[PDB]
Amino acid sequence: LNPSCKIMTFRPSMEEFREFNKYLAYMESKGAHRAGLAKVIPPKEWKPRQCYDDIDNLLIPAPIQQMVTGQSGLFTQYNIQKKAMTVKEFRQLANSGKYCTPRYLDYEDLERKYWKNLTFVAPIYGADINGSIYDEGVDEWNIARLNTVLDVVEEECGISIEGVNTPYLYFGMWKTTFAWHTEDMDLYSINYLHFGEPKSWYAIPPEHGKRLERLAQGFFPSSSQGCDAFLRHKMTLISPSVLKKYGIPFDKITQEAGEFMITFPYGYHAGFNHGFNCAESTNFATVRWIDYGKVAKLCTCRKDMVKISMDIFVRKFQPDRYQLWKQGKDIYTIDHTK
Ligand SMILES: CCN(/C=C/N(C)C)C(=O)CNCc1cc(C(=O)O)ccn1
Ligand SMILES: [Cl-]
Ligand code: NI
Ligand SMILES: [Zn+2]
């Protein structure tokens, strides 16, 4: 049990690291999910790719220029699509004087500069790129093939996962942002920083996520009246100063190159990149997630958001509740600590 709901860091030996599914069960048995986010540092011997040199030639089809509007810790973001770029040209852009990381003392100093400089030069994010850059044959923690409940349902029952268990690449530069959100259907996610500058994360315990939602509804009431789950648009920024002021419990942590971050069901998170970097991530599920997916609040203003039917999961893994659930009588409130 993790009663403070603080973000945990794990350093498994190679023997402990080999099987991701087993280690994830271990992390939750230590209460790691109560923070909504955890870090895993793999042993120094492990390498998902021997050489990153040829990633320079990888094409970024639709780089995103992030426009931020607002003031004093409350901002809305929108995106402007830019012309296709290779990684090499993106890296040179990121390291130019207009876009490079500012000088800083420590991560805390840099965090301050992030929140002070959001509304000046708009950073460009090479985000949401289909693909993986693991070497072929890496069997440990292969983001492209984790073999979780999502995969079992797709391969054995022939049910469309809607591409949420496929890998995505993120080429960041300084000040590029991911806004406050939980994952689609309130799924888990895993994120590996292949190389480059760090990525800083903010996390809200699942047991306090509703308080973040109430706070955001009061500060963005127009966004709120337009969509019940508007935070899923990933356009809402709220600074740690605002969260402290209104008593929202949260934690922060910086992910360095070579480290995994895992987000848990209904764990709100947000953050920013320190500089040029490259990350890979996917969504996944465990049996524990099923009760979250059954009550996840979905986006009601856009046509084809990611909506996965829960029927197969309840029928196969919750046989004792299936008919009650389809009857509308499977009433419960989630215990985020178990
Ligand atoms: C599993 C990857 N994924 C699926 C992308 N599709 C929505 C396009 C996500 O939505 C991840 N959630 C956004 C996000 C982005 C970042 C980031 O910008 O590095 C960090 C944490 N979370
Ligand atoms: Cl700056
Ligand atoms: Ni995310
Ligand atoms: Zn919506």
Side-chain angles (χ1 to χ4, degrees), residues 1-14 16-43 45-135 137-154 156-302 304-337:
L1 277 305
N2 174 26
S4 71
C5 302
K6 282 303 171 280
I7 293 169
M8 294 170 74
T9 297
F10 296 81
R11 312 189 162 75
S13 68
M14 190 62 196
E16 293 162 346
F17 178 77
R18 291 193 181 279
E19 299 295 320
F20 163 83
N21 295 305
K22 167 181 194 160
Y23 202 69
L24 178 72
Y26 172 79
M27 299 171 59
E28 293 203 337
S29 85
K30 298 308 197 201
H33 53 296
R34 292 193 61 180
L37 179 70
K39 169 186 300 190
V40 177
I41 301 172
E45 42 264 54
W46 182 78
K47 278 186 273 304
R49 196 191 174 99
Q50 297 296 302
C51 183
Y52 287 107
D53 285 357
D54 288 343
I55 305 305
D56 247 6
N57 314 315
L58 175 42
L59 188 68
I60 308 173
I64 289 314
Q65 179 178 256
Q66 312 190 287
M67 313 313 298
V68 175
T69 291
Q71 57 262 293
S72 58
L74 293 174
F75 307 90
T76 290
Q77 179 173 265
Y78 69 90
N79 296 147
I80 296 174
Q81 180 163 315
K82 311 297 249 180
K83 45 84 175 170
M85 236 177 292
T86 67
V87 170
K88 185 185 160 166
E89 325 171 307
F90 179 91
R91 186 187 68 214
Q92 298 169 332
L93 194 63
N95 295 328
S96 69
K98 175 172 190 167
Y99 296 102
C100 68
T101 309
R103 308 190 181 106
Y104 67 92
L105 284 200
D106 57 18
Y107 289 163
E108 176 191 61
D109 188 39
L110 186 65
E111 168 179 27
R112 245 134 42 200
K113 291 180 205 285
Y114 171 74
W115 288 107
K116 287 174 176 167
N117 290 100
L118 262 183
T119 54
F120 298 121
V121 173
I124 298 145
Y125 207 176
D128 295 323
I129 302 175
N130 291 95
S132 179
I133 65 183
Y134 277 55
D135 279 340
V138 168
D139 295 322
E140 314 81 14
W141 293 58
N142 194 313
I143 278 176
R145 41 187 219 256
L146 287 171
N147 266 309
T148 79
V149 155
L150 290 197
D151 299 301
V152 173
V153 140
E154 183 169 27
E156 309 289 355
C157 301
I159 291 205
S160 171
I161 284 308
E162 294 298 277
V164 312
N165 61 342
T166 62
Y168 291 90
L169 300 177
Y170 298 84
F171 294 93
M173 72 175 57
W174 160 239
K175 234 166 57 174
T176 57
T177 298
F178 53 111
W180 280 107
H181 68 284
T182 61
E183 300 306 294
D184 293 323
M185 299 296 301
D186 292 346
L187 285 163
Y188 297 71
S189 68
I190 181 168
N191 185 291
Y192 181 73
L193 195 53
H194 279 286
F195 59 82
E197 291 311 297
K199 184 195 298 295
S200 283
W201 297 67
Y202 303 101
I204 287 157
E207 64 193 73
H208 297 120
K210 287 305 175 189
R211 301 165 53 176
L212 178 78
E213 296 180 357
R214 284 197 294 281
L215 177 63
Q217 292 162 20
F219 281 136
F220 304 86
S222 177
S223 296
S224 181
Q225 86 169 26
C227 181
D228 291 333
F230 74 89
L231 290 179
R232 300 198 185 274
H233 309 167
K234 287 190 264 171
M235 301 286 115
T236 310
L237 286 61
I238 303 177
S239 85
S241 294
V242 173
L243 299 167
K244 295 190 197 76
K245 180 170 180 182
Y246 291 83
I248 309 298
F250 75 96
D251 198 6
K252 65 183 177 180
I253 196 170
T254 298
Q255 174 191 20
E256 313 231 40
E259 307 182 335
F260 292 95
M261 302 300 308
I262 293 180
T263 75
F264 291 86
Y266 201 61
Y268 275 99
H269 56 282
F272 61 95
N273 295 299
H274 288 202
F276 172 73
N277 64 14
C278 164
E280 184 176 328
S281 77
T282 193
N283 290 118
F284 68 92
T286 65
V287 166
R288 201 177 66 81
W289 158 80
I290 295 166
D291 278 345
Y292 291 81
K294 294 160 67 194
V295 303
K297 186 169 65 172
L298 310 177
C299 167
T300 46
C301 70
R302 177 204 167 114
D304 193 15
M305 287 285 296
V306 171
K307 186 189 51 178
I308 298 178
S309 174
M310 293 313 264
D311 178 87
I312 183 63
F313 296 102
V314 181
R315 177 168 71 84
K316 277 305 190 185
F317 302 96
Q318 302 183 153
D320 294 348
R321 304 159 67 179
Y322 180 61
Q323 283 166 274
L324 188 83
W325 175 70
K326 260 157 56 171
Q327 219 174 340
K329 296 197 168 191
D330 184 25
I331 262 54
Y332 61 92
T333 59
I334 292 181
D335 184 354
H336 303 289
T337 74

